[PDB]
Design an enzyme around this catalytic site. Structure first.
Site, PDB file in Angstrom:
ATOM      1  N   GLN A   1       0.807  -1.204   0.124  1.00 32.67           N
ATOM      2  CA  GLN A   1      -0.097  -0.215  -0.171  1.00 32.67           C
ATOM      3  C   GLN A   1       0.744   1.267   0.065  1.00 32.67           C
ATOM      4  OE1 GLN A   1      -4.195  -0.004   2.200  1.00 32.67           O
ATOM      5  NE2 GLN A   1      -3.252  -2.099   2.162  1.00 32.67           N
ATOM      6  N   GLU A   2       0.305   2.473  -0.404  1.00 34.29           N
ATOM      7  CA  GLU A   2       0.788   3.818  -0.397  1.00 34.29           C
ATOM      8  C   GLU A   2       2.262   3.553  -1.180  1.00 34.29           C
ATOM      9  OE1 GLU A   2      -0.333   6.772   0.699  1.00 34.29           O
ATOM     10  OE2 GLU A   2      -1.969   6.356   1.910  1.00 34.29           O
ATOM     11  N   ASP A   3       2.296   3.553  -2.672  1.00 32.07           N
ATOM     12  CA  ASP A   3       3.499   3.407  -3.314  1.00 32.07           C
ATOM     13  C   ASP A   3       4.795   2.464  -2.817  1.00 32.07           C
ATOM     14  OD1 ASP A   3       2.164   4.788  -5.403  1.00 32.07           O
ATOM     15  OD2 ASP A   3       3.574   6.552  -5.257  1.00 32.07           O
ATOM     16  N   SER A   4       4.232   1.178  -2.208  1.00 38.55           N
ATOM     17  CA  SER A   4       5.082   0.268  -1.807  1.00 38.55           C
ATOM     18  C   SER A   4       4.927  -1.163  -2.724  1.00 38.55           C
ATOM     19  CB  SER A   4       5.196  -0.098  -0.539  1.00 38.55           C
ATOM     20  OG  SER A   4       3.862  -0.600   0.034  1.00 38.55           O
TER      21      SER A   4
END
Ligand SMILES: [Zn+2]
Ligand SMILES: [Zn+2]
Ligand SMILES: [Zn+2]
Lengths: 266, 65, 134, 114, 46
Positions: free
Chosen positions: C2-5
């Site tokens: 999640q969130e640009d991982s």
């Protein structure tokens, strides 16, 4: 023949295509996992470097050497080096290999894994043979050499499993499908027009039956039948992968049973 | 930089395969397509492991000592 | 993821996907303009000055350098040298305070000004661990 | 560098046990067994089968964190019937199904060519 | 066996001492590399 029901339709030395009837999905699964993950094997796992004048760095080759397919047929009678009472290795826990080649010609001299050589005593078991499927007869391709470059190594192959490093995996790619038409509606198929015209009919759609428009949704039904297929790298022949799969699943099921028996004590 | 052994994604050995690949394209004249297929390379993660790999080794060899 | 991982296949990594070699170069020389004070390369010890580095010197031979085969990490001295002042003050160079690896090549030359001059290389393989920017 | 050695996946550490069994406080006749050095390959089977037994009210498992190799299975049963047994009967019932598969496969494999 | 240095371009087993500074033997170039050790190094094969 009293429960779980196999039936092969196609089988080679690296492909076992079979239906597996009459089972819990949860099992079929746990079979495929423990297949990929937990069946023991032998693969190089310590490289002592004497000389290396290759265009390739030390730790590189070391890595490359890891992956090479080594015979594990009789492997379930070699000991874990963490277990064996010797300080570091022995022939009771490890096979040792030697590699040397050396730039001899002008034309690029290859280093196949056919150029690998057992040193330690096999005590007559079937172990540690670099495996060659190659028609020409040359296992893998370690490295390459120009006119004047030695390479002197010493591979210590040790027992191990995929959960520790995918080198110890024996398995490769495992095919797995259940219920080809969506009769169990375990999925909801995406589309723009006809769900049927738009997705493809899986080869596995002859050994099952079409739904027939009129019928309402069958609910209390569950998952039988799983259209699998096992490929093999070939440390182990295909049959023994699936066998030893069923085996190791059982062995580690079995050890819980033991552990409960060990705790009534105190 | 030397054909990898075994594709990262599937597992299947792909070392022993570089040579044969070269040959089936440039000798008895096939397209990389059918050639990837004679080798038994169906799954395309293990199809892309060969079609893409670039044999730079050929070039470090060049450098003399 | 999640969130640009992103989540990666641990398996494929061991199989090699996205590995690098990381060579690094250290570098050195011997004073320059001096008629009574000139630097020197040697695997030092005491001798009146006692300002020596925290770490292990023992990886060094006699010329003052490490050999190539050797593994290094922590405050391993990698090039020792003395600035003899009025007897011999230390000026050797530790491998980076955070690093670790295997010596690759070791360069020994002179500079235009007749200088004794050095270039030790160190190598790691850096495997794609958890938070690495992709 | 902070990385935790591979083998800490299947090898037990120290003072650790392959199971610890503890009594759930919420319900009656209920228990949550811990399973050191294990995961889904094992929990998901135990559970689903522990659900074919009609004297079991409740049966669930969960990998608390994919960093460590644990996995907690919690079972609740009928009046009387101690959970261990439940876990037992099912544990076995699987070995037997597995044993059959082994032989059944061993039979077919032998009938083929190549 | 008892070797100390090697020049870069051709590969000559040189091994001269301090109060000699630099230079090859009938090849000149003041470059020079430090050979190798014989603590023959062990590899994680992973
Ligand atoms: Zn031993
Ligand atoms: Zn693949
Ligand atoms: Zn020279």
């Amino acid at each position: 023949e009293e429960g779980p029901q196999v039936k092969i339709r196609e089988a080679s030395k690296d492909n076992v295509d079979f239906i597996l009837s009459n089972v819990d999905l949860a099992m079929a699964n746990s079979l495929r996992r423990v297949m990929i993950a937990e069946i023991p094997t032998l693969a190089i796992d310590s490289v002592e470097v004497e000389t290396n004048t290759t265009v390739l760095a030390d730790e590189f080759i070391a890595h490359r050497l890891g992956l090479i397919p080594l015979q594990s047929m009789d492997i379930e009678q070699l000991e874990y080096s963490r277990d064996c009472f010797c300080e570091d290795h022995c022939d009771k826990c490890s096979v040792v290999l030697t590699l040397q080649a050396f730039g001899e010609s002008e034309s690029t001299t290859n280093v196949y894994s056919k150029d690998l050589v057992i040193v330690s005593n096999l005590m007559g078991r079937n172990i540690g043979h670099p495996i060659i499927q190659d028609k020409e007869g040359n296992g893998v391709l370690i490295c390459k050499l120009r006119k004047g470059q030695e390479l002197k190594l010493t591979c210590v192959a040790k027992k191990g499993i995929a959960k520790e490093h995918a080198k110890w995996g024996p398995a490769a790619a495992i095919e797995f499908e259940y219920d080809p038409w969506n009769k169990l509606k375990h999925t909801d198929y995406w589309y723009e027009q006809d769900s049927a015209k738009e997705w493809p009919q899986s080869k596995n759609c002859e050994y099952e039956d079409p739904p027939n428009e009129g019928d309402p949704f069958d609910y209390k039904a569950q998952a039988d039948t799983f259209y699998m297929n096992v490929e093999s790298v070939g440390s182990i022949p295909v049959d023994q992968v699936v066998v030893r799969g069923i085996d190791t699943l059982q062995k580690k099921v079995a050890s819980i049973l033991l552990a409960l028996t060990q705790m009534d004590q105190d | 930089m030397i054909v990898p052994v075994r594709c990262f994604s599937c597992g299947k050995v792909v070392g022993d395969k570089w040579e044969s690949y070269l040959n089936l394209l440039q000798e008895d004249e096939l397209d990389e397509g059918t050639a990837l297929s004679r080798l038994g390379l169906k799954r395309y993660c293990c199809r892309r492991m060969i079609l893409t790999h670039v044999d730079l080794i050929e070039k470090f060899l060049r450098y003399n000592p | 993821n999640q969130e640009d991982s992103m989540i990666m296949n641990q398996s494929s990594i061991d199989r090699g996907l996205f590995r690098s070699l990381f060579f690094r170069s250290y570098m050195d020389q011997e004073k320059k303009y001096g008629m009574s004070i000139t630097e020197t390369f040697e695997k030092p010890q005491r001798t009146n000055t006692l300002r020596m580095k925290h770490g292990t010197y023992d990886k060094l031979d006699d010329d003052g350098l490490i050999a190539p085969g050797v593994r290094v990490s922590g405050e391993d001295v990698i090039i020792g040298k003395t600035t003899p002042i009025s007897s011999k003050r230390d000026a050797s160079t530790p491998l980076r305070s955070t690093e670790n690896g295997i010596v690759d090549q070791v360069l020994v030359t002179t500079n235009q000004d007749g200088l004794k001059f050095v270039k030790v290389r160190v190598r790691t393989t850096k495997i794609p661990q958890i938070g690495d920017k992709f | 560098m902070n990385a935790p050695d591979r083998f800490e996946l299947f090898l037990l550490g120290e003072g650790e046990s392959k199971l610890k069994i503890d009594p759930d406080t919420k319900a009656p006749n209920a228990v949550v067994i811990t399973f050191e050095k294990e995961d889904h390959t094992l929990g998901n089977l135990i559970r689903a089968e522990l659900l074919n037994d009609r004297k079991v009210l409740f049966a669930a498992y969960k990998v608390e964190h994919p960093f460590f190799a644990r996995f907690k299975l919690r079972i609740q049963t009928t009046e009387g019937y101690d959970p261990k047994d439940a876990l037992k009967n099912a544990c076995n019932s699987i070995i037997n199904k597995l044993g059959a598969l082994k032989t059944n496969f061993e039979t077919e494999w032998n009938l083929q060519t190549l | 066996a008892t070797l100390k240095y090697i020049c870069a371009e051709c590969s000559s087993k040189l091994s001269l001492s301090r109060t000699d500074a630099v230079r090859c033997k009938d090849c000149g170039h003041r470059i020079l590399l430090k050979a190798r050790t014989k603590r023959l190094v062990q590899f994680e094969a992973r």
